[PDB]
Design a protein around this ligand. Structure first.
Ligand SMILES: *[C@@H]1O[C@H](CO)[C@@H](O[C@@H]2O[C@H](CO)[C@@H](O[C@@H]3O[C@H](CO)[C@@H](O)[C@H](O)[C@@H]3O)[C@H](O)[C@H]2NC(C)=O)[C@H](O)[C@H]1NC(C)=O
Ligand SMILES: *[C@@H]1O[C@H](CO)[C@@H](O)[C@H](O)[C@H]1NC(C)=O
Ligand SMILES: *[C@@H]1O[C@H](CO)[C@@H](O)[C@H](O)[C@H]1NC(C)=O
Lengths: 283, 48, 285
């Protein structure tokens, strides 16, 4: 195997590690069906400030998914759930948070950061003023918000409250101080993963060498050289007649490249015999 | 042509892993999430 | 301002067979010298569609089902269908998206709008400019707002044949509404021209609304508002299997649906247009 020589880190223009108060500094979080959207754009982020705060206590990513960042905008989503509905903040996994309140995208997946608010966001009668959707005529697709402040028809027929046998779309959580951990209000920041990049620097195009490379949406080792492929302006990269990518439009300077793999192969040994000699020649 | 392409397309079989990509399973998932699904795609591709 | 018309009629329901419609670039992958088989949310071939002949009193934009995604076509002479309300309830009761082209910009927002009972473009008919976006009055609890880069489109009443054919495909995925754009020049008397036309990606829209209905915002024309001549359709995207023939430049040049007829279900097994004479095992029943 030919051992590579060089690093190729190519990206569009670079900003610094920005501070994000929407990640770790927000004090009051609203309901989950009307989950507050704040976003992250154009910053090389690590989200170590998820860990680095005195406002949170869980520190888990859905935690190797913390560095899962060389894509479009991350949405730091602010809402308070219950302990039995911490479990439903997930890509898919259609519980009462995911099917109707807050569904998560599934290209990459961020971090769900809860915090113990037994003494602030709860009461002994149940802080029922925070609510959630449990049944609605229509399921959420991923990354949606539901701000229907409306008395709801439970079957699609004109049965709205305050008429009889007509249901509300909102149950109470049951944020009790007198219960255990399963019924506590938990201030939850979710980084919805659907332009930031974690390992985002800029290095040189080490062309015509067995290198490493890290691109906008493309990693691997190989040989780099300009290409002549008629890329469309809406086409990022090329693939071969097989299904691995061998051509890329450069993330930094848009030069259409080729990606051949590094050279490799077998080894023979041509010997005439130990009784004959002790020299060999290899193929 | 067929026996190469059948050998080609069975690279892209998941074999019970979360993807058929050994470097996503390497890099994107946890190191306990990795070796579970590294050991799946080898035994799949080895007997393919 | 939420205003109504003098008369809103039903269209002529003129039936048509959509021959080669709905094709787009799914991915950002370039491939060449190749022939690629995929399913995605596609408009099928030979699909029976209906002609929404909007003519001078007819105004077709009720609640129309979206449910995953839709195909849209419009042979245009007066450039009438230029807006779309997306959402679930179509009232000021759930979060909706108003995508409009107001002859200067593409204005897209994601809010709980004060939705009128009539989605139209209040446009003066003898000159073709919009007075007010009389679809909402204001908005509440927004998540998105955008204005595109500026240009101009002549949207007055024109006569003769249809000179403009626009091809539109809308789809709900991961919050991102994907809206793709196709266009060709035409010279069109009746329902639709036969022929092949692709689409390309333009918009990646994290709108965040429950997309289950759509009301295609038309353009009103009166100097009490009316309309004028526009032939536009409604089609449905289905999880069907397509072949994708790529030329040497990576332009999709032809496509074959697998689920039309047993001839074209055979093509997806052979992976060609050329099929030799004989018998070929295809999938079980
Ligand atoms: C892919 O797109 C490229 C354009 O970027 C196409 O290349 C160009 O194709 C045209 C039409 O074949 C060529 O024009 C021809 O020029 C000759 C020379 O005078 C003339 O005799 C012909 O009547 C015709 O006008 C053009 O030269 C060519 N460009 C270059 C640089 O050669 C290409 O054809 C497209 N691919 C396919 C498969 O069509
Ligand atoms: C080595 O080759 C020679 C060639 O004639 C032979 O005579 C000799 O026996 C060989 N050596 C052994 C150990 O057999
Ligand atoms: C398409 O459906 C309509 C139903 O309104 C029907 O009248 C028409 O004949 C159909 N088209 C064909 C080609 O059968």
């Amino acid at each position: 195997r030919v051992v590579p020589s060089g690093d190729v880190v190519r990206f569009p223009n670079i900003t610094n590690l920005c501070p994000f108060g929407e990640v770790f500094n927000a004090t009051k979080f609203p309901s989950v069906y009307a989950w507050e959207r704040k976003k992250i754009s154009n910053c090389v982020a690590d989200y170590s400030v998820l860990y680095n705060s005195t406002f949170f206590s869980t520190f888990k990513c859905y935690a190797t998914k913390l560095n899962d960042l060389c894509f479009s905008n991350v949405y730091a989503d602010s809402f308070v759930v219950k302990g039995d509905d911490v479990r439903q903040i997930a890509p898919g996994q259609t519980g009462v948070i995911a099917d109707y309140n807050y569904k998560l995208p599934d290209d990459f997946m961020g971090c769900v950061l809860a915090w113990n608010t037994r003494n602030i966001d709860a009461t002994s009668t149940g802080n029922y003023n925070y609510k959630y959707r449990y049944l609605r005529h229509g399921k959420l697709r991923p990354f949606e918000r539901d701000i229907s402040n409306v008395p709801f028809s439970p079957d699609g027929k004109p049965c709205t409250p305050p008429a009889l046998n007509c249901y509300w779309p909102l149950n109470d959580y049951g944020f009790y101080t007198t219960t255990g951990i399963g019924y506590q209000p938990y201030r939850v920041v979710v980084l919805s993963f659907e332009t930031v990049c974690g390992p985002k620097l800029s290095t040189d195009l080490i062309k015509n060498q067995c290198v490493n490379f890290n691109f906008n949406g493309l990693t691997g080792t190989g040989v780099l050289t300009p290409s002549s492929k008629r890329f469309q302006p809406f086409q990022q990269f090329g693939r071969d007649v097989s299904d691995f990518t061998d051509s890329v439009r450069d993330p930094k300077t848009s030069e259409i490249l080729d990606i051949s793999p590094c050279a490799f192969g077998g080894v023979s040994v041509i010997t005439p015999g130990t009784n004959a000699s002790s020299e060999v020649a290899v193929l | 042509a067929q026996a190469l392409n059948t050998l080609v397309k069975q690279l892209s079989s998941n074999f019970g892993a979360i993807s058929s990509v050994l470097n996503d399973i390497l890099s994107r998932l946890d190191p306990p999430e990795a070796e579970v699904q590294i050991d799946r795609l080898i035994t799949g591709r080895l007997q393919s | 301002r939420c205003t109504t018309f003098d008369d809103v009629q039903a269209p002529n329901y003129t039936q048509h067979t959509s021959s080669m419609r709905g094709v787009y670039y799914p991915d950002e992958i370039f491939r060449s010298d190749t022939l690629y088989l995929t399913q995605d949310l596609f408009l099928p071939f030979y699909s029976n569609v209906t002609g929404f002949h909007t003519i001078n009193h007819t105004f077709g934009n009720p609640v129309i089902p979206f449910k995953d995604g839709i195909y849209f076509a419009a042979t245009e002479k007066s450039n009438v269908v230029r807006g779309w309300v997306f959402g679930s309830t179509m009232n000021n009761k759930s979060q909706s998206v108003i995508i409009i082209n107001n002859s200067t910009n593409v204005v897209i927002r994601a809010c709980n709008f004060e939705l009128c009972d009539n989605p139209f473009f209040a446009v003066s008919k003898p000159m073709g400019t919009q007075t007010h976006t009389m679809i909402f009055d204001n908005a509440f609890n927004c998540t998105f707002e955008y204005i595109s880069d500026a240009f101009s489109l002549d949207v007055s009443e024109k006569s003769g044949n249809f000179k403009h054919l626009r091809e539109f495909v809308f789809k709900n995925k991961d919050g991102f509404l994907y809206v793709y754009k196709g266009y060709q020049p035409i010279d069109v008397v009746r329902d639709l021209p036969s022929g092949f036309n692709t689409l390309k990606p333009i918009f990646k829209l994290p709108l965040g609304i429950n997309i289950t209905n759509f009301r295609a915002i038309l353009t009103a024309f009166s100097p009490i508002w009316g309309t004028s001549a526009a032939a536009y359709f409604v089609g449905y995207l289905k999880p069907t299997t397509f072949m994708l023939k790529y030329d040497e430049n990576g332009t999709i040049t032809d496509a074959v649906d697998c689920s039309q007829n047993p001839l074209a279900e055979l093509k997806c097994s052979v992976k060609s247009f050329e099929i030799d004479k004989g018998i070929y095992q295809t999938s079980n029943f």
